[PDB]
């Protein structure tokens, strides 16, 4: 009614965030993220491995997002992997295409050994908007970079972080587009759109999800909002 969503949030406001870097210390880098009552923990494990034969002078980054049955009553009924896989690919597309990692500097022995960066995100608690929460957690975990070069001689250095991709997922309540949808709003309307943006104002990844269609105006407003709440977010938690 009063310009506000089902909660006090305005159309461009996210829920409360809590980011806890180095939550799993025995990993090379890690981050716990709470977005309202959505809770995930991302973990990065860096290991020396063989690069792909086609790109021999580049390290590898593989992403995997686990929808643990603890996170929702309905989980393991289904559990449809379709949602859990989709989030892995969107989160990985945003991280990959933002060139956040800079994977040419992850070469140990050209064409034989590179640094493989496993990014695994375990969802512990589900309250809507898994895509944005997962991306935040992944970003934060990649900033505790700590690549173990000491096992390969060398020198422990910080995995290079070249950008800050912030993904924003948006849904259409009535005639108004809102962002960071809660679990009520995520089911209230069919159709979401996620837009991942870097601090240079570039769009790095997009993904329309769920059943439903969006006008061209909606898409224009979603790109504009994602850049605008994406800028606000970048300064507040990733200074």
């Amino acid at each position: 009614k009063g310009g506000k969503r089902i909660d006090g949030r305005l159309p461009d406001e996210f829920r409360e965030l809590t980011i806890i870097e180095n939550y799993i210390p025995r990993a090379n880098g890690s981050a716990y993220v709470a977005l309202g009552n959505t809770r995930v923990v991302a973990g990065v494990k860096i290991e020396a491995g063989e690069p792909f034969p086609d790109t021999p002078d580049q390290g590898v980054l593989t992403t995997n997002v686990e929808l643990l049955p603890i996170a929702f009553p309905s989980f393991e009924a289904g559990p449809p992997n379709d949602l859990a896989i989709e989030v892995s690919r969107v989160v990985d597309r945003g991280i990959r295409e933002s060139k956040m990692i800079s994977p040419e500097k992850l070469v140990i022995e050209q064409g034989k050994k590179v640094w493989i960066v496993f990014l695994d995100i375990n969802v512990l608690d589900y309250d809507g908007n898994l895509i944005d929460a997962s991306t935040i957690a992944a970003v934060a975990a990649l900033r505790n970079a700590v690549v173990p070069a000491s096992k390969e001689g060398g020198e422990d250095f910080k995995l290079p972080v070249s950008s800050t991709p912030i993904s924003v997922t948006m849904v259409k309540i009535g005639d108004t587009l809102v962002c960071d949808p809660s679990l009520e709003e995520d089911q209230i309307c069919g159709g979401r759109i996620t837009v991942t943006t870097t601090e240079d104002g570039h769009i790095r990844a997009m993904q329309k999800g769920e059943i439903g269609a969006f006008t061209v105006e909606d898409v224009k407003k979603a790109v504009k909002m994602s850049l605008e709440v994406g800028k606000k977010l970048r300064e507040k938690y990733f200074r």
Binding site: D82, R93, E97, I193, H202, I203, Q207, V216, V219
Partner: protein
Amino acid sequence: KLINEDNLRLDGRSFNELRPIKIQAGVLNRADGSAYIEWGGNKIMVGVYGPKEAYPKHSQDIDHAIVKARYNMAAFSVDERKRPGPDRRTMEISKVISEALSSSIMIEQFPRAEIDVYIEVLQADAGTRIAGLTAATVALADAGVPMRDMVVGCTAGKVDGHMVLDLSKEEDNYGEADIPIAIMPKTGDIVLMQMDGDVTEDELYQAMDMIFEATKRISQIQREALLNKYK
């Protein structure tokens, strides 16, 4: 290493030029509806079964029908022999196509029903997922499945600073962006949209209009593929 010489792409097309596209509908005998498409190097078979009630009643859904599209790639369909069966990539495609088709199919006309769409890509060029969605609407009108529109779509992206249309395999791997979009031509509503890479707000809005104007050239093919059945 670079993609264009004369404002000419490696394969000789201008910036907004489509690859060769063929569509024949009704090629399959068992399937209720079917459509074969050739889009560049892409050769994709689509067959459509349904609508029917689910048995046993467990998977049933009382509001509307269920669109279960399955995208599968043949073992000889990609550059190196791939193991048959779905993977993380084909599962993400089968969902995204199922969601788009659910938006044009008049899903409320068959409650508790299931609609199977089998998309078998036998040889794959780039943008493969859209040739199957383009063929899915052709197979669906062949099957008598009610639709409010015929979904159609095309790719765009950034290559050497220029926004180009219908990217080729080379352009996809080494170019700067890929934007697959599928729309409902009547309304312009987007029912499928993904994006990879690096693009400014301006270039994305440029890319969209390019796709939007390619949809008219594509829809004509679809409409001509069902029109050759009678004649």
